[PDB]
C-alpha cells in the first residue's frame, strides 16, 4: 500500500547493483518483481506463480533484469519451472508466499545475483524495496523500477511489517538490507492498509531456497 505521501523514487541506474538483479518479471496475466538469487533462478511471491483461489499456476512468461524505461538494458531470459513451497499450496498463509523461477538462460552470471541472510529478528534494522510498481507504469506509461528504505517497524516470528511504500507489482520485492544480502520478500499490506509486510528469510524459508537452488 501507499501510506500517506508516496516516498518512491526511480531508480538512476540499473546497470549496477543491486538494480541490476531486481527484475521485471511477467506471467500471462500479472506481472510482479523478482531477484536473482543463482544463476537461473529468481526469487519472487507465491502468488505470483500460484493462485490459491483458482488452484492454478501462472502461465509462464519472461524475466527482464534492470528493465528501466521500458528497455531491457541487460537482457532477457524466458521462465522455464516453478518451485512453491508445499505450505504455500496447501495453505495460501502468508509466511509460505515465497516461491523460486528457473530460467532457461544462466542470466544471472551476466548480472550478478544477491545472496540471502538468515535472520531471527529485524525490528529496528533499514530496509530497501525496489522493485516495479504498476502505479507509476500509469502514471509515466514506462516500465522502470523504483526504490525506498525504510526501518523495520515490527515483526513476528515469520513476518516483517514496514511503513516503505508499495503497489500491485511490487509482489515479490527483495527486502535488502545495508550489504546488499536479501532478508525476506515483500507481500501484503496488513492492518486495513496502514502498514506493509512480508515473509522473513527465517530457517524455514532459507530451507526451501536451498532446495530450490539445487533444481
Not at 500500500?1 to 516516498?7: F, L, N, P
Not at 508466499?97 to 541472510?117: C, H, L, M, P
Request: aromatic share 10%; hydrophobic share 30%.
Amino acid at each position: 500500500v501507499v501510506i500517506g505521501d508516496d516516498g518512491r523514487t526511480k531508480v538512476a541506474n540499473t546497470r549496477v547493483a543491486p538494480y541490476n538483479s531486481i527484475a521485471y518479471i511477467t506471467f500471462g496475466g500479472s506481472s510482479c518483481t523478482g531477484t536473482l538469487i543463482a544463476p537461473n533462478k529468481i526469487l519472487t511471491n507465491g502468488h505470483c506463480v500460484y493462485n490459491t483461489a483458482s488452484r492454478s499456476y501462472s502461465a509462464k512468461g519472461s524475466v527482464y533484469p534492470g528493465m528501466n524505461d521500458s528497455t531491457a538494458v541487460n537482457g532477457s531470459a524466458n521462465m522455464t519451472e516453478f518451485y512453491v513451497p508445499s505450505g504455500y499450496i496447501n495453505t495460501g498463509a502468508s509466511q509460505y508466499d515465497f516461491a523460486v523461477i528457473k530460467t532457461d538462460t544462466n542470466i544471472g552470471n551476466t548480472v550478478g545475483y544477491r545472496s540471502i541472510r538468515q535472520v531471527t529478528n529485524l525490528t529496528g534494522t533499514t530496509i530497501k524495496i525496489s522493485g516495479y510498481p504498476g502505479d507509476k507504469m500509469r502514471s509515466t506509461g514506462k516500465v522502470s523500477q523504483w526504490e525506498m528504505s525504510g526501518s523495520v517497524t515490527r515483526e513476528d516470528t515469520n513476518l516483517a511489517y514496514y511503513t516503505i511504500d508499495t503497489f500491485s507489482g511490487n509482489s515479490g520485492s527483495a527486502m535488502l538490507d545495508q550489504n546488499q544480502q536479501i532478508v525476506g520478500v515483500h507481500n501484503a499490506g496488513y492492518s486495513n492498509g496502514t502498514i506493509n509486510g512480508g515473509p522473513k528469510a527465517t530457517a524455514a524459508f532459507v530451507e526451501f531456497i536451498n532446495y530450490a537452488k539445487a533444481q
